[PDB]
Amino acid sequence: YDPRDETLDDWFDNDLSLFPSGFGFPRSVAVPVDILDHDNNYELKVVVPGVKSKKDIDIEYHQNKNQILVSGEIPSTLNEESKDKVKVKESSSGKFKRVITLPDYPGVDADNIKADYANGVLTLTVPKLKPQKDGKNHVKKIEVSSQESWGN
Amino acid sequence: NDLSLFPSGFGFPRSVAVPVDILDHDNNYELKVVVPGVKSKKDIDIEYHQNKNQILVSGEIPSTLNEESKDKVKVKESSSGKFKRVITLPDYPGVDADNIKADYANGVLTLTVPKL
Amino acid sequence: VKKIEVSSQESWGN
Amino acid sequence: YDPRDETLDDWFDNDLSLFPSGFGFPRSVAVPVDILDHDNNYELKVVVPGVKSKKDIDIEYHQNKNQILVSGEIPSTLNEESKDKVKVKESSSGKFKRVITLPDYPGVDADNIKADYANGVLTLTVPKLKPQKDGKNHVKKIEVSSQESWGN
Amino acid sequence: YDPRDETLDDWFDNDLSLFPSGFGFPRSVAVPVDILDHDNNYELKVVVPGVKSKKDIDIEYHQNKNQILVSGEIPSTLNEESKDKVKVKESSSGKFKRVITLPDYPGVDADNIKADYANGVLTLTVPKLKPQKDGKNHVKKIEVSSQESWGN
């Protein structure tokens, strides 16, 4: 993936999931998403960045892009008497956008899309009735023959 | 306007950089740290010093492993590990050291140090 | 047709 | 090569258990050190490769620094008539000292120090039967409510 | 020289100065070992780095290869809840294994070896009856051709 550091640290017992390559997800503010791949359902958990609201986060799907579009506003403060700071490093943006292309393979279903907000994290449980065929190769032709028990 | 304008005339020494916002409202010391997706509020300890009279917070956001409900393809995952918030309060005796309350809600940890 | 979601609340802890 | 998990595992192929922590540390001139922490009693083990009698080691408490005076010497095998000094290698540490720095708050005991000698291992337990300088001892009060069961 | 160990090594001139022969039997966990060579006994002090155990360390002789074998584990610390590691660095390898090719001449009888552990050091004394004939030569030969001083 990367030259050294971020290729090897992707396995279990301290952070990450296996991550060879990757395609860009257009967004403001970069925060990971877990994809639980199944053919009976599909998971999208978008870690919302400590937003106290959740009713100002609009979740919608483009059937014109095949992408899940979630937008929201990151908390911000304005200089006031009853606000007085000693330290500040709060975010670096006041608005957050994620544009997510699903690598779920042709057979997408999201028009039945349902959402939940759990633990300060937006979780979208995406119904799937497809694909069971017609992925990369039209009608799956996975290894099922070897002319023996496994071949030797 | 995502942080705010604040000239440096105060500062409390600290290690590890995470999004923070010290807030002083009435007479309390309050801090908003971005810690979302932390399962249980007992994975973050909020310890108030009885030998310094100061707040001290540490936490850890659960770390992603290799999963049997996820097929690994090209999907990134990340979290922040162990971290410590070293906040010093030169607020002096006259502050209640037994009435500190922390409010972890919506992925936002809100602290209150009364000073009733 | 454009679809929207509006799932919110559940602010009682878990 | 840089798996923080395997880095810590490689550290823990030298002691075979769970996880480390951080406390103290200032020292000048390296000697064997094993810093293990109980409830508030702290443990120090300095390996000796055998020593002639137990009168070659002194244990006291620094009354002017709030430190612990641990000092010893292990004699060298010398004037051997059994076999000439032309083959074999022997090394035994000379005059070593250990300066133990504890920023552990007032309530340390300087008379209840116990040093145990057995199996050629220096065993040191420093009480610490009172961590706090406050009236309540061993008490740090934490969060008790948050108006939600966890947070979401 | 300038190092303490080096000037100590130079101070082992008690009938000749001691410096490395140019060989040393396999070592895991660097700790020296002492041999005293004789044909009436062979005295071997395996310097042990402070093992708490004394039933888990094994001593065996191989009469087929004529190698004395001593091996065991270094007992490492644990992290539990009344054991909380900070930093430690003893027990660099958990397994130590001692093979020695005896340079005490053939005729050694190490089936009469005695083992005892005390002070933090393993002490092994191998009593000898042979060598005294049928050792390196069958009935020893000493050159007695000498004198003839009167000029020529």
Residue numbers in the entry:
A (entry chain I), D (entry chain B), E (entry chain A): 63 to 214
B (entry chain J): 76 to 191
C (entry chain X): 201 to 214
Could you pull the original sentences from the published paper?
Hsp26 is a small heat shock protein (sHsp) from S. cerevisiae. Its chaperone activity is activated by oligomer dissociation at heat shock temperatures.
We could resolve the structure of the ACD, the CTR, and parts of the MD. These dimers are the principal building blocks of the 40mer. Surprisingly, a β-strand of the MD extends the β-sheet of the ACD and then a helix leads further into the core of the structure. Thus, the MD is intimately connected to the ACD and three MDs associate with each other. While the CTRs exhibit some flexibility, their density is always visible even in asymmetric reconstructions indicating that the IEV motif is predominantly bound to the β4/β8 grove of the adjacent dimer.
